[PDB]
Amino acid sequence: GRQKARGAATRARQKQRASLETMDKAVQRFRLQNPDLDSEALLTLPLLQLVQKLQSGELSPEAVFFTYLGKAWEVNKGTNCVTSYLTDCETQLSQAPRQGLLYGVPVSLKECFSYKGHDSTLGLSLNEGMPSESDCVVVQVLKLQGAVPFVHTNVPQSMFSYDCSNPLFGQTMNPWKSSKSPGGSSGGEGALIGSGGSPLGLGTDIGGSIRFPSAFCGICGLKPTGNRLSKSGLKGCVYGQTAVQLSLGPMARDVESLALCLKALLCEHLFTLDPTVPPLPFREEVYRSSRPLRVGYYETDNYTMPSPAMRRALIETKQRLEAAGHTLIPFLPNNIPYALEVLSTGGLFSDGGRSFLQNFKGDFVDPCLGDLILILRLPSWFKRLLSLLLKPLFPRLAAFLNNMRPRSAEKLWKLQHEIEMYRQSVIAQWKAMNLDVLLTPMLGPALDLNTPGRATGAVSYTMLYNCLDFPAGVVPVTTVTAEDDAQMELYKGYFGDIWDIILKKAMKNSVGLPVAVQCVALPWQEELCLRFMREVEQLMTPQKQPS
Amino acid sequence: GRQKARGAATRARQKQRASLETMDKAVQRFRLQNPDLDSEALLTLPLLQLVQKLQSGELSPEAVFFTYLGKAWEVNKGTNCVTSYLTDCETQLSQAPRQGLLYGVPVSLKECFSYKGHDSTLGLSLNEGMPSESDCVVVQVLKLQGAVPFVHTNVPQSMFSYDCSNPLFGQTMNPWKSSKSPGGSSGGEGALIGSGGSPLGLGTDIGGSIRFPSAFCGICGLKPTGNRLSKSGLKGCVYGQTAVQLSLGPMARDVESLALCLKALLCEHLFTLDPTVPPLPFREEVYRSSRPLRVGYYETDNYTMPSPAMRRALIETKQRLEAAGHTLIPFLPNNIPYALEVLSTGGLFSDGGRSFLQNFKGDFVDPCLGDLILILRLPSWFKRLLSLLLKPLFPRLAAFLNNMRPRSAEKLWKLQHEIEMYRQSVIAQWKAMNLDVLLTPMLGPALDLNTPGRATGAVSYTMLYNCLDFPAGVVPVTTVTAEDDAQMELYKGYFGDIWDIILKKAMKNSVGLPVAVQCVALPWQEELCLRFMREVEQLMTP
Numbered sequence A: 001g002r003q004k005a006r007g008a009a010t011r012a013r014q015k016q017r018a019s020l021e022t023m024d025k026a027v028q029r030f031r032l033q034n035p036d037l038d039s040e041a042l043l044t045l046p047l048l049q050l051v052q053k054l055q056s057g058e059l060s061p062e063a064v065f066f067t068y069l070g071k072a073w074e075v076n077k078g079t080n081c082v083t084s085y086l087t088d089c090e091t092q093l094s095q096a097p098r099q100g101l102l103y104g105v106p107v108s109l110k111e112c113f114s115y116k117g118h119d120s121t122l123g124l125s126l127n128e129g130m131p132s133e134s135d136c137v138v139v140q141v142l143k144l145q146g147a148v149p150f151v152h153t154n155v156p157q158s159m160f161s162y163d164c165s166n167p168l169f170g171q172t173m174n175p176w177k178s179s180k181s182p183g184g185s186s187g188g189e190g191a192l193i194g195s196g197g198s199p200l201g202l203g204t205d206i207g208g209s210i211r212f213p214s215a216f217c218g219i220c221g222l223k224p225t226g227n228r229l230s231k232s233g234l235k236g237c238v239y240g241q242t243a244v245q246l247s248l249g250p251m252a253r254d255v256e257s258l259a260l261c262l263k264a265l266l267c268e269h270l271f272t273l274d275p276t277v278p279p280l281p282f283r284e285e286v287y288r289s290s291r292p293l294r295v296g297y298y299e300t301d302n303y304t305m306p307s308p309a310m311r312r313a314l315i316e317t318k319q320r321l322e323a324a325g326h327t328l329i330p331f332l333p334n335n336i337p338y339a340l341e342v343l344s345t346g347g348l349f350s351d352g353g354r355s356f357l358q359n360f361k362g363d364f365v366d367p368c369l370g371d372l373i374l375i376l377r378l379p380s381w382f383k384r385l386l387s388l389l390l391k392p393l394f395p396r397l398a399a400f401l402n403n404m405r406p407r408s409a410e411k412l413w414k415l416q417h418e419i420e421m422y423r424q425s426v427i428a429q430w431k432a433m434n435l436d437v438l439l440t441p442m443l444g445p446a447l448d449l450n451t452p453g454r455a456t457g458a459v460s461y462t463m464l465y466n467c468l469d470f471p472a473g474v475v476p477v478t479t480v481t482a483e484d485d486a487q488m489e490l491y492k493g494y495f496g497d498i499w500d501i502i503l504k505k506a507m508k509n510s511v512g513l514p515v516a517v518q519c520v521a522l523p524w525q526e527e528l529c530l531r532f533m534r535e536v537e538q539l540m541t542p543q544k545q546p547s
Numbered sequence B: 001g002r003q004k005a006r007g008a009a010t011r012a013r014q015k016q017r018a019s020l021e022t023m024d025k026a027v028q029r030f031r032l033q034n035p036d037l038d039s040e041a042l043l044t045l046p047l048l049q050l051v052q053k054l055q056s057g058e059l060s061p062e063a064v065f066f067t068y069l070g071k072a073w074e075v076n077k078g079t080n081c082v083t084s085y086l087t088d089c090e091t092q093l094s095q096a097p098r099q100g101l102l103y104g105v106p107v108s109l110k111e112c113f114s115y116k117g118h119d120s121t122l123g124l125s126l127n128e129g130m131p132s133e134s135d136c137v138v139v140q141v142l143k144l145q146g147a148v149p150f151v152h153t154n155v156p157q158s159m160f161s162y163d164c165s166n167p168l169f170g171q172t173m174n175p176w177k178s179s180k181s182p183g184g185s186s187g188g189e190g191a192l193i194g195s196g197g198s199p200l201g202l203g204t205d206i207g208g209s210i211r212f213p214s215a216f217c218g219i220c221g222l223k224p225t226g227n228r229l230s231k232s233g234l235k236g237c238v239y240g241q242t243a244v245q246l247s248l249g250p251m252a253r254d255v256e257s258l259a260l261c262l263k264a265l266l267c268e269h270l271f272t273l274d275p276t277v278p279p280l281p282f283r284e285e286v287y288r289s290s291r292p293l294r295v296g297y298y299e300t301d302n303y304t305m306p307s308p309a310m311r312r313a314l315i316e317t318k319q320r321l322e323a324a325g326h327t328l329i330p331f332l333p334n335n336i337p338y339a340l341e342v343l344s345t346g347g348l349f350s351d352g353g354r355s356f357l358q359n360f361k362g363d364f365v366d367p368c369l370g371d372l373i374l375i376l377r378l379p380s381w382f383k384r385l386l387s388l389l390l391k392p393l394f395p396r397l398a399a400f401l402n403n404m405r406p407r408s409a410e411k412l413w414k415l416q417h418e419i420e421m422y423r424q425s426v427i428a429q430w431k432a433m434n435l436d437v438l439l440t441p442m443l444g445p446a447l448d449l450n451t452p453g454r455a456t457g458a459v460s461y462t463m464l465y466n467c468l469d470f471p472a473g474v475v476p477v478t479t480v481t482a483e484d485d486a487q488m489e490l491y492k493g494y495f496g497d498i499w500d501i502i503l504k505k506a507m508k509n510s511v512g513l514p515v516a517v518q519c520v521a522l523p524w525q526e527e528l529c530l531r532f533m534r535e536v537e538q539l540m541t542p
């Protein structure tokens, strides 16, 4: 019984095809009216300068919108990042509040951000042909700030993946190399922004979904503290799981864009539309601070062996920060294997994967999901038995499998309490070293298509911060050299299990691909996190800022 | 099998007795050295005036400390609200930060606020002889603000109660009438502050534990949004339940004291000590605003029939607010039975009470807890069958029973998502009426001792706001008249089940007892909630 799944894919593909055709027509209509417009100059303007020219009236919102729309349509040809054109955006463009902080800015949205009249399929047949009836809160706030949300971008099926394919819209490809994943689950956003088709987008992240596509595609991304921004109207395939906090955040070409997006979102409109969000205004003085920092750092988490490019990106950033007067302090959050295997894995799959699996009933399982669905469908007794068998040779595989078993509400409370204690334990470590921020490696270079689903272990660098619920962002700092890439032949991983074997092959053939570092601060310290990211970007890529 | 429990009770009573003797000795010594001090004038000073005189140097921290210590010792005689004297407070007194916003202010703490070298028993044998290694975060912040925490105050055993007795320290009594409950679980705080033994205290609330004792004892109390203040170091008996968040907040004689306490607590010190707390400073401009309000209100929640005094208190407050230029809008949060029976009950007892029951193994069960332990101990199939049988005649009893059953993590996720959606539902309902605030009845007058445990349904007025996680505070507005009390004889309740029958009897003989109203604002709007409470206070107690 795959006719239901086939029908949904046929309809989704027709809608995506019609969307792209509508974009093409609007772009051609505009271009014939504006032949002298310097499109390349407008497309390469950093967001801050684009916003200033829109606010002064130097650039019209139409020129900006239609030029980006044309670029999005062009880059989509080689990336397949766009699932839907938000058709009513041209009416929003004419009504954009003039004094809005993002006036005339086209914004791309990950498919899960509910947008009136459009599906949020998550690549699942069960959600095809069920359009949203209202804009989610952050979309309402973007519009109230004069921004023009224009496209829905692709996600891997269900979003529980750092790849970017689903049976409805297909596979999104990295704009730097077609054989590579753009990362995920905000992969469509990573590919679109990374190829210049959008100056700003929004993604979501429970295990690294903003950070993986930002790093793989060579753009900046911030995952705030879970409750810094409204999650009201965000479509997900599992609800009520609170142990591992989901967060939403900006993705863009530079750090200043992330800070402007955060400043525009953290306004009275957001706080009144969603009173559950603490009304914490963006602290400009914290973001703009030039005071020296006490930077904790690690070159490896001893769980996922860093690629030679990751290790060099980290070491070089560390050295530039030291030369700039910051204090670099070795720091490693305690019990990383326990935080990932017991707390994160157990938090995400407390019910054995039953709630998640309901979404796949009668659907195709995208190959980019690997054996995740097959593994989760196993009876609890069998996950326990197979875990006992795997334990002596492959303890990491045994530990994940054992922690993907269903449990009682009593055991969930115990797990939730352990998450709270673990959070305080890392805060205590941080305080004992008097850190301001933390610098870590970020997974990269981009993995080959269809390999993220077979290298689960590699979520270690990002997922730890969803478990801890700390703001964490990524900044591109270097590109893979042939030297770094040849060095992948000596890569063994710490465990030598299937995930390490996959990761070794998957990170090969990555010359010229972007590589990032991750910047972290304590809960509610997004402005300090961004101040540090701004520092990293300035020291490693000085051209990206006013020079 | 109660030897361990008996020994814990003997040692607790010894320590309580020795604490009170230490207090008396310190008080008599100070009084001998300062016989000219006007103790009555000092004690009657409203907290803000007390703070001003302490800041200027008109009153010494020593004078304020020992005067309040003596009063606390005296009021404890008829209330039994003090479990422990925080010994080292005389050392804190001399070292109190001079520029602190609470410089020299004696503060009472509910027993669950961990204090270095003291037990936080919660009235449980298992917690006796387990002294805290350190002060909890809020206690550290109070001290950094120059306050002087001086006593631990009594709680009902486990704190899952709105009465105030445990088998270790015994029963706390209302200072207005010894046969009455001081409310709970922050009962010791209510009885102490309510009788003038402390100008400021801290309590905690998951189902009304700040609000019940403040209302029952005729004092002000505020339960903020769960995560407005740090819960780091708070002693609890159930951990990891996050469906219904616990909140902590101030208790005091007036609204201004609550606003000062919040202002003092919402400082860089708290935010640095506990980074998990959003760094929201006290918004003085919102608290000080005097703009006309759109006040939603209800005379009844259609769940707990209000006592005639509760209804009168609500109507009079509504009328005074309208006369002062506010807009009073009829408003009742939708689906209150579901919020209480399914979300609140289910959220508190998702595991069928197994984690809670662990605490009572080998212990006595205080009579004030009623049948809560016996009911939670029932096997799941039995709670189910008993609920099915009760459903046709007593649907309220049947609904609470079925929702006190254990469940899977899958079902807990579903319940957690239902709590989030219900919160958005009431927020949407509130915004459709363009409310600023909400005025509700507040359970009162004080129930007789050992009756809260047999009147579960009466948590409806308060527990609704724990489920919704909205800031909610209480203000005394009137006292029970002969007429209010006579009309209570005609009280029926909406269900006619055991909980409504008990409430009528439990509220008998209440002439002169204080009655409150409850003020609610949206999440994180503590400043607005207090601005509204100040308004009620100005109108009802001019």
Ligand SMILES: *[C@@](O)(c1ncc(-c2ccccn2)o1)[C@H]1CCc2cc(Oc3ccccc3)ccc2C1
Binding pocket: A159, A160, A161, A162, A184, A185, A186, A204, A205, A206, A207, A208, A209, A210, A235, A236, A237, A238, A246, A344, A345, A348, A372, A400, A456, A459
């Ligand atoms: C992203 O962080 C992501 N994007 C959206 C969501 C999400 C999840 C739940 C509810 C709403 N939204 O998450 C993904 C990063 C990669 C990833 C990988 C895994 O893999 C996995 C399998 C087994 C055990 C541990 C981890 C799961 C989830 C994600 C989230």
Ligand SMILES: *[C@@](O)(c1ncc(-c2ccccn2)o1)[C@H]1CCc2cc(Oc3ccccc3)ccc2C1
Binding pocket: B159, B160, B161, B162, B184, B185, B186, B204, B205, B206, B207, B208, B209, B210, B236, B237, B238, B246, B344, B345, B348, B372, B400, B456, B459
């Ligand atoms: C208080 O709100 C209170 N005080 C401390 C705590 C607490 C709870 C859990 C963890 C840490 N602290 O709560 C009490 C108000 C009255 C009350 C009543 C009931 O009764 C009940 C029985 C069956 C079903 C629903 C409610 C339970 C809890 C409380 C909390």
Ligand SMILES: [Cl-]
Binding pocket: A227, A278, B227, B278
């Ligand atoms: Cl929060």
